[PDB]
């Protein structure tokens, strides 16, 4: 292919590897979710746009929405993660270890 | 072409507004100066401590409703196809939906500050 | 399991996204409409098994319009010896292919 | 929770799988798993207590991680192919990725890790949801792109899950930890068949359901969450104790009950692609899964462990719960073998 | 695969119209009127042979008709279209509404020296019929021959050999 | 070498992704995050989608400003770490952008890379379009056929931001 | 395997080729086994309330039994059809390529030869 | 309904008028007669170009010129 | 549109002159092979255009409309 | 993966026995490494230290039971001049089993380990002679 599709492969496997391995923080693991939601969006819009797809512009901002779908999700499910515990470290949710 | 130039050019002209602003005077630099300001007196604690918000479910709210009405936005565009019924339908839907959204937000008392 | 509704209820929910060879709006084309075109009437109703090596023809032609790989690769080689000849000093660039050029219109 | 905010919640999950089942389009696809994950979060923090918190956020983030590399899938496969139609890719990289997402969403191992804590973490309405419905969504995605997937990547997942699930099973006292195991073993046994015939898939998916749906009821009714509650069982109401025996006999895979019907046809299915080691090496596994049954059965029903004296008071109090299909679930999970070539309806 | 056929760079040579955009959007009217048939033929030829290579001389054809509608216009009424294309020249947005004085003289210059009649509205836009004598390309896709179909399926069905056939099943 | 912008600008995305996707602390996380979603639009705005750039540009500013004020509330520290205040981090950023480097510089040598797919070196400029689009452009008509033709599309993305307000509203209740 | 089969005409539980096949009789034994499944069930239904499970509710075994028997027969009905199919495409598949499935001789046992293994 | 009209005019006037100006703007495209105006309008814009047919000989309602008086007019947008 | 296309293909007539001129003394190598293997015509590519031109007309052509204020 | 044991297989039985100990000795030490990487992964180590040592310890325990299990049976193949025979490869795998006792400083092991990975080796030797699929390609 090409070489900005390269960058943007690249740009995704950097947010899958940061993401892949937690530094006990929560939101730094949404951080690179949304980058590697970002990353998706810039190679999908890039490839509609290269090919004239006309019809498949619907595609990506839609994808964008459901971006949130999850990712404002992810904070309601910190709210009470912190209303847990003081902090929102990730070593402090190991109670079903047993 | 230009766009690059004119943020090339508003950036020199910011940056360099701080290095004339710093080199210029005289500067006298001591272990009490420099302190953060409290109104006097030093403070207790630090800043970097958690400050406990209270807006969390409108700071959600709005996170889904700036991407739910930017699907609106092409709405101007939308006025331009042939299919009309269809397009006038679909928008008013999506609208609708937003303002069950924001009642359903509303008499459930969501936009109440905690505590 | 994939139960089809739509073609049951003959209801139309995506299939107009599907290809780039359906009906765009105010008769866009797509850059590849007629190798997609050509790839889909070739391999409609024979089945995958027979159309992977039936039509790979025109899904490879589809595929080169897709990505210009091969394109690609013919440039770079045009553009590496042409650099070369001219390190070497063998070759003169025309003047059409300079900026003095005088084109068409 | 609301009741009318539940009946809604439970219709926009049924509607995601809908989405996914009946969708001819990768990108519907991808928002009827959006739609089915976001609305089966809530179902899982039902009664608001820290363990509930836990698993919904190892739930959701592996559910995210595995609908990112789903969709670079989708997005690697529309770049190699240019359309959108639901059917066999054209590209090996978007197949393992596709293959590596959908064993995260059905938990398969070495992607298991999440599944016995979040079971244990919800109640149990939630668990049976989650380990029943919540499993029919990537197994059609998986019958939908058959062509496609690797056959070393799919049999090393199936026979991986099918191992460690029945290594996990024996280790564990609570009841929704056993069932979370077995669910991974299962999903090896159903992944295992997949490439040569879906139908054996299918009947297997569906005996799985019956079962673990009939399992996870007479756990209701009985209103058990370890074992210790599952042995006192016999006080209350023995009828349950030979209900919860005659299942967990039927999910061990003995004749002649109805548990040995996916597995023995889905070995009719690997002799004749002239696969004999693996499904000897399937069956050997499974027994471990029969084992931690059996020990389940020895505590619940054959014999009679002390009780105290509370459960004199409820001696005086029948059942009142809403005990569903239960009757005709159990005939199904027991006693369904003499109808065998009724799966031909699945084709 | 097979060598690219391009047409020498003699063939393509054709004195072109070589006036500026706001001098044709001036003129574009009349242009469109009164010489219709040989862009219509060639655009004709364009949307049936899909080939650029296949449409030369119509496209000659169309070059010559222009630059003939051109010098009919420089013969007759040279200054008041002077005029007209200075003042669409002049603006931005080349906009239509912003010199209708000098077009109306342009109009009734040329309607009364030419006998040409500026068409109404929505007029340029309509499709028209060709009537063109080249035949009509059998295969202009260059596809090739098509696999034959799989046999569909026909005859009455019959009842199971002997049932289901599964192990000990007798039906 | 401005024919190469795109490549340059791809560039200091990824830069800013290995700059976030380090983790130092999720205030220079977000800021790293505005820059890599600054030359995204950026790219995607040189390839002709200005309104799909200048929509997920202001998508991501609003989020991203939204998380800034959950983690000045809730996860904060005493000693925030920059980038050099953590070894781990500053290794791995380190490691990040000379791995990126070295990609460049191979691929700015013999034009070509192989990186489990197969990349030319060229720049994108190649692969555009020679011919205008008349006096529409495609993205924008692309994006307004969503009401003219994408009813099921409008109807399930409305359905599902309204049942995620409703989630939002019933996870975070306590009781 | 035989999806694309249902391609052309998908979601029908019985086609127009399912009404030339003969319907199973009411005398089925594998109707009878599914009515007993139903009786089987009103058994339990009875057995795990605390009911009489001979006496209490006989409307309630009747009505298990009927919705049984009208499944399993409509099941059944699908089962004979689905294999009527495969016996179908079956032999339509090999009268159509008589070079794949080339007749055999059928040789006598005075010419052919067995190797004998004596057990002493 | 007097009652929770003036009632609910008093304490918020803003929903009120919110309600009346999404209720009209709901009922009132299905009663106006120009819906259909902006229709043809719609459908009357030049964005592609009249690609011409062939002339095979029987063709009477399509012209051979602009200028013909066969063909679809719009001297109702002129009119209005 | 007759002028685009007697443009674009004055344009590839003279992109495949020079390309004789430059690879004639590569081994195995064939003048004007096309890619593609059926002998239908398709759209030039930016890169079989102005591959052998000064960069001065690329960001004229493939990033002018665009960077045009 | 697939590169190492075709390396393995393609060298003829007791011809080169130094080759065959090496390609042997690469995969005992690719089993060990993918071994120590999920010990390491799922069981953090308390330092760096701790880690590479097990790392090191698992991949030379792999690593010395391959080389010898190939050492040994590539030995029984020239011995007996017998190259397709499992017999060869039973005493390779008992040979790679006291390895692991000998590493795991235990008796009983090592005898379990020499009976388990000799009936292991003979039944890869059988399906290699008798062309048995592990991995079959569906064809029905
Ligand atoms: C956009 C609006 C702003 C535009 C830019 C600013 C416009 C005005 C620029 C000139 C301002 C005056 C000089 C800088 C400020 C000096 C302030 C001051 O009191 O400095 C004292 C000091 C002198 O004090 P000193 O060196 O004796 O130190 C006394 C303090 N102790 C002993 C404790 C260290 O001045 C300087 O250091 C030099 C100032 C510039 C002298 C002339 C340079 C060449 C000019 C041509
Ligand atoms: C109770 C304790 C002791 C139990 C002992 C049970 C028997 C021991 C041996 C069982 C082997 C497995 C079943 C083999 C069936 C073979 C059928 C057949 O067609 O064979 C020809 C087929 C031939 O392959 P094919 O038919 O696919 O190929 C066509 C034929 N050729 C080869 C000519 C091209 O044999 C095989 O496929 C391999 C057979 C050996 C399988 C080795 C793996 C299993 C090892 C034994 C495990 C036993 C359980 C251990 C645990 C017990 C519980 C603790
Ligand atoms: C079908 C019409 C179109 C409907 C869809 C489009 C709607 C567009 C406008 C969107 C509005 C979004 C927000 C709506 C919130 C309503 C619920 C609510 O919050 O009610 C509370 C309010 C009483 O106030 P209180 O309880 O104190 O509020 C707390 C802090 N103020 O309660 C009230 O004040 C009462 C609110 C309900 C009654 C309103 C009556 C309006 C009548 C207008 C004239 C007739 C219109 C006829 C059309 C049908 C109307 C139902
Ligand atoms: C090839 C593809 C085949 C696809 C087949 C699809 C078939 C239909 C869908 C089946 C999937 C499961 C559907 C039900 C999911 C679980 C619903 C659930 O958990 O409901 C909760 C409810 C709670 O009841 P209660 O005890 O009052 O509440 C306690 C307080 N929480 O109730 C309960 O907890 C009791 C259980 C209620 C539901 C039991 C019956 C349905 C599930 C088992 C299947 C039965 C056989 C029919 C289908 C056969 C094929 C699968
Ligand atoms: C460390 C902290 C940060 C330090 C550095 C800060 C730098 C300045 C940050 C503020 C400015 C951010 C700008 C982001 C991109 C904005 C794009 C834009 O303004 O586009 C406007 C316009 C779109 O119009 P369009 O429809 O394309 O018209 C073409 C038809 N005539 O576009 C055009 O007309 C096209 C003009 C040429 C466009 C070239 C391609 C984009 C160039 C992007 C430059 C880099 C931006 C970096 C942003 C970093 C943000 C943190
Ligand atoms: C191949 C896969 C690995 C790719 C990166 C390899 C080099 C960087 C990592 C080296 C090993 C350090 C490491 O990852 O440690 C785990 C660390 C979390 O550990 P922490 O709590 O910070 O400290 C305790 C012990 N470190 O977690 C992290 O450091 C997470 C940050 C990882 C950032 C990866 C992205 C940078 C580019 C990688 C190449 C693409
Ligand atoms: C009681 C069952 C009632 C069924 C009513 C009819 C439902 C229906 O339309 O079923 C159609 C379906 C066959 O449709 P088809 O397109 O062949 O599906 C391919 C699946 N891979 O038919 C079937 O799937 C029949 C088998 C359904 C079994 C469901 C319970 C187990
Ligand atoms: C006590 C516990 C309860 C009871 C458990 C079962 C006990 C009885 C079964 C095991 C008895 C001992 C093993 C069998 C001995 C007799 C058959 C045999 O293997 O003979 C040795 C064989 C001789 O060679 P030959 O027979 O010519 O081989 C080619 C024919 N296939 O030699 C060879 O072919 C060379 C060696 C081949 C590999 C042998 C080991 C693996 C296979 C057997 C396991
Ligand atoms: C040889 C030898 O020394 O074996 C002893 C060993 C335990 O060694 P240790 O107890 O440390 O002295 O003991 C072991 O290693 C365990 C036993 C070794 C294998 C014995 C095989 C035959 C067992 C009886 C089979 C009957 C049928
Ligand atoms: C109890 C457990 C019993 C297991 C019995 C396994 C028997 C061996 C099966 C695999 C095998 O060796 O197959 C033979 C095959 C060589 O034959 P062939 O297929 O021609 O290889 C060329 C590659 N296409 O070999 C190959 O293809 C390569 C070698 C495969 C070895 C697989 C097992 C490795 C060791 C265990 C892990």
Not at chain 6, 106 to 129: C, S, T
Request: glycine share 6%; hydrophobic share 45%.
């Amino acid at each position: 292919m090409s070489l900005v599709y390269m960058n943007i492969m690249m740009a995704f496997t950097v947010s899958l590897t940061g993401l892949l391995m937690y530094r006990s923080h929560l939101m730094s693991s949404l951080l690179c979710l949304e980058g590697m939601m970002l990353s998706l969006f810039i190679l999908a819009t890039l490839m509609i746009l290269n090919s004239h797809f006309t019809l498949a512009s619907m595609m990506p901002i839609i994808l964008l929405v459901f971006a949130a779908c999850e990712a404002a999700l992810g904070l309601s499910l910190l709210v009470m993660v912190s209303n847990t515990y003081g902090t929102d470290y990730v070593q402090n949710l190991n109670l079903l270890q047993c | 072409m230009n766009l690059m130039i004119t943020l090339l050019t508003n950036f020199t002209l910011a940056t360099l507004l701080v290095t004339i602003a710093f080199w210029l005077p005289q500067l006298n630099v001591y272990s009490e100066k420099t302190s953060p300001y409290e109104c006097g007196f030093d403070p207790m604690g630090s800043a970097r401590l958690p400050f406990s918000m209270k807006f969390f479910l409108v700071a959600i709210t709005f996170l889904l409703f700036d991407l739910e009405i930017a699907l609106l936005l092409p709405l101007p565009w939308a006025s331009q196809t042939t299919n009309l019924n269809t397009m006038l339908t679909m928008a008013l839907l999506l609208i609708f939906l937003l303002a069950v959204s924001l009642a359903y937000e509303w008499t459930q008392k969501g936009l109440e500050w905690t505590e | 399991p994939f139960f089809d509704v739509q073609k049951k209820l003959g209801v139309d929910l995506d299939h107009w996204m599907t290809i780039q060879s359906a009906e765009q709006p105010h008769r866009i084309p797509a850059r590849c409409h007629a190798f997609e075109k050509e790839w889909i009437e070739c391999a409609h109703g024979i089945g995958s098994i027979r159309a992977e090596k039936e039509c790979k023809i025109e899904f490879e032609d589809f595929r080169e319009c897709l990505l210009r790989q091969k394109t690609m690769k013919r440039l770079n080689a045009i553009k590496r010896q042409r650099d070369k000849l001219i390190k070497e000093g063998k070759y003169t660039p025309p003047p059409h292919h300079s900026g003095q050029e005088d084109l068409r219109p | 929770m609301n009741p009318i905010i539940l009946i809604i919640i439970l219709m926009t999950v049924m509607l995601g799988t809908i989405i996914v089942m009946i969708s001819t389009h990768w990108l519907l696809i991808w928002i009827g798993f959006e739609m089915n994950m976001l609305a089966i979060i809530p179902i899982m923090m039902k009664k608001h207590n820290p363990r509930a918190t836990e698993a919904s956020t190892k739930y959701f983030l592996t559910q995210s991680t595995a609908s990112m590399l789903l969709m670079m899938a989708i997005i690697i496969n529309l770049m190699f192919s240019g359309q959108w139609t639901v059917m066999k890719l054209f590209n090996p990289m978007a197949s393992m990725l596709m293959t590596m997402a959908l064993a995260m969403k059905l938990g398969m191992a070495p992607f298991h890790f999440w599944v016995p804590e979040v079971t244990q973490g919800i109640p149990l309405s939630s668990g049976l949801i989650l380990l029943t419905w919540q499993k029919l969504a990537p197994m059609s995605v998986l019958y939908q792109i058959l062509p496609s997937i690797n056959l070393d990547l799919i049999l090393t997942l199936s026979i991986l899950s099918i191992t460690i699930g029945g290594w996990g099973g024996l280790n564990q006292t609570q009841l929704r930890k056993i069932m979370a195991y077995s669910s991974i073993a299962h999903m090896g046994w159903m992944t295992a068949v997949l490439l040569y015939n879906p139908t054996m898939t299918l009947l297997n998916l569906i005996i799985y359901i019956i079962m673990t749906s009939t399992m996870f009821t007479l756990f209701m009714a009985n209103s058990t969450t370890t074992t210790l509650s599952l042995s006192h069982t016999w006080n209350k109401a023995p009828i349950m104790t030979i209900l919860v025996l005659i299942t967990l006999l039927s999910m061990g895979g003995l004749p002649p009950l109805s548990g040995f019907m996916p597995k023995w046809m889905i070995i009719q299915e690997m002799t004749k692609n002239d696969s004999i080691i693996l499904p000897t090496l399937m069956a050997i596994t499974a027994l471990l899964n029969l084992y931690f049954y059996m020990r389940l059965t020895y505590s619940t029903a054959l014999t009679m462990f002390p009780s105290t004296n509370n459960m004199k008071m409820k001696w005086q109090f029948p059942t009142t719960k809403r005990m569903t299909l239960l009757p005709t679930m159990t005939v199904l999970s027991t006693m369904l073998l003499p109808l065998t070539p009724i799966l031909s309806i699945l084709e | 695969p097979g060598i690219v056929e391009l047409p020498s760079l003699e063939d393509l040579k054709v004195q072109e119209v070589k006036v500026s955009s706001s001098v044709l959007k001036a003129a574009a009217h009349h242009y469109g009127a009164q010489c219709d048939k040989p862009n219509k033929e060639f655009m004709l030829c364009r949307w049936e042979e899909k080939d650029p290579r296949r449409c030369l001389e119509e496209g000659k054809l169309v070059n010559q008709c222009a630059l003939e509608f051109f010098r009919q216009i420089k013969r007759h009424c040279a200054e008041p279209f002077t005029e007209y294309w200075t003042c669409i020249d002049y603006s931005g947005l080349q906009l239509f509404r912003r010199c209708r004085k000098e077009q109306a003289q342009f109009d009734k210059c040329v309607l009364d020296k030419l006998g040409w009649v500026r068409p109404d509205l929505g007029e340029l836009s309509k499709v028209t019929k060709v009537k063109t004598d080249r035949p009509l390309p059998e295969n202009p896709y260059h596809s090739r021959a098509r696999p034959e179909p799989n046999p569909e399926v026909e005859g009455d069905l019959k009842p199971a050999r002997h049932g289901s056939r599964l192990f000990f099943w007798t039906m | 070498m401005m024919t190469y912008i795109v490549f340059i600008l791809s560039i200091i995305f990824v830069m800013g992704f290995v700059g976030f996707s380090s983790k130092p602390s999720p205030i220079y996380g977000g800021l790293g995050l505005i820059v890599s979603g600054g030359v995204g639009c950026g790219i995607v705005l040189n390839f002709g989608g200005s309104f799909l750039g200048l929509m997920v540009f202001l998508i991501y500013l609003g989020g991203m400003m939204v998380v800034f004020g959950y983690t000045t509330a809730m996860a904060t520290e005493q000693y925030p770490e920059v980038w050099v205040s953590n070894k781990v981090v500053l290794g791995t950023f380190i490691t990040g952008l000379l791995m990126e480097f070295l990609m460049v510089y191979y691929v700015l040598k013999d034009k070509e890379v192989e990186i489990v797919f197969k990349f030319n070196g060229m720049g994108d400029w190649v692969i555009y379009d020679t011919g205008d689009s008349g006096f529409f452009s495609e993205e924008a008509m692309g994006i307004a056929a969503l009401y003219s033709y994408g009813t099921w599309l409008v109807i399930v993305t409305g359905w599902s931001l309204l049942i995620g307000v409703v989630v939002i509203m019933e996870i975070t209740r306590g009781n | 395997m035989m999806t694309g089969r249902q391609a052309r005409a998908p979601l029908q539980f019985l086609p127009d080729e399912a009404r030339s096949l003969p319907p199973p009789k009411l005398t089925d034994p594998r109707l009878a086994y599914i009515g007993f499944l139903g009786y089987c069930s009103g058994l339990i239904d009875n057995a795990i309330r605390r009911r009489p499970v001979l006496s209490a509710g006989l409307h309630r075994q009747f009505l298990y039994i009927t919705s049984f028997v009208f499944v399993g027969y409509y099941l059944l009905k699908r089962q004979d059809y689905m294999y009527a199919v495969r016996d179908h495409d079956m032999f339509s598949y090999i009268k159509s390529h008589p070079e794949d499935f080339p007749e055999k001789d059928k040789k006598t046992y005075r010419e052919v030869f067995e190797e004998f293994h004596p057990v002493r | 309904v007097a009652a929770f009209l003036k009632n609910v005019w008093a304490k918020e006037p803003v929903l009120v008028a919110s309600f009346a100006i999404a209720g009209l703007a709901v009922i009132l495209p299905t009663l106006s007669p120009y819906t259909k105006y902006s229709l043809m309008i719609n459908r009357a814009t030049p964005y592609n170009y009249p690609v011409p047919l062939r002339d095979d000989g029987n063709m009477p309602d399509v012209p051979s010129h602009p200028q013909d008086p066969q063909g679809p007019s719009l001297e109702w947008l002129k009119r209005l | 549109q007759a002028e685009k296309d007697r443009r674009v293909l004055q344009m590839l007539r003279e992109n495949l002159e020079e390309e004789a001129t430059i690879m004639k003394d590569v081994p195995g190598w064939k003048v004007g092979e096309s890619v593609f293997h059926t002998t239908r015509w398709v759209t030039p590519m930016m890169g079989e255009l102005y591959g052998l031109r000064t960069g001065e007309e690329i960001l004229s052509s493939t990033y002018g409309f665009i960077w045009y204020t | 993966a697939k590169t190492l044991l075709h390396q393995y297989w393609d060298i003829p039985e007791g011809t080169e026995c130094h080759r065959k100990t090496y390609a042997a000795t690469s995969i005992g030490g690719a089993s060990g490494l993918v071994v120590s990487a999920y010990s390491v992964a799922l069981k953090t180590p308390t330092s760096f230290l701790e880690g590479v040592a097990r790392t090191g310890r698992y991949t030379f325990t792999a690593a010395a039971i391959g080389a010898i299990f190939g050492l040994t049976s590539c030995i029984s193949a020239q011995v007996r001049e017998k190259p397709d025979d499992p017999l060869n490869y039973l005493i390779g795998g008992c040979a790679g089993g006291l390895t692991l006792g000998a590493r795991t400083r235990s008796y009983g092991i090592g005898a379990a380990a020499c009976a388990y990975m000799g009936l292991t080796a003979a039944l890869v030797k059988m399906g290699q002679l008798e062309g048995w699929k592990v991995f079959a390609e569906p064809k029905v």
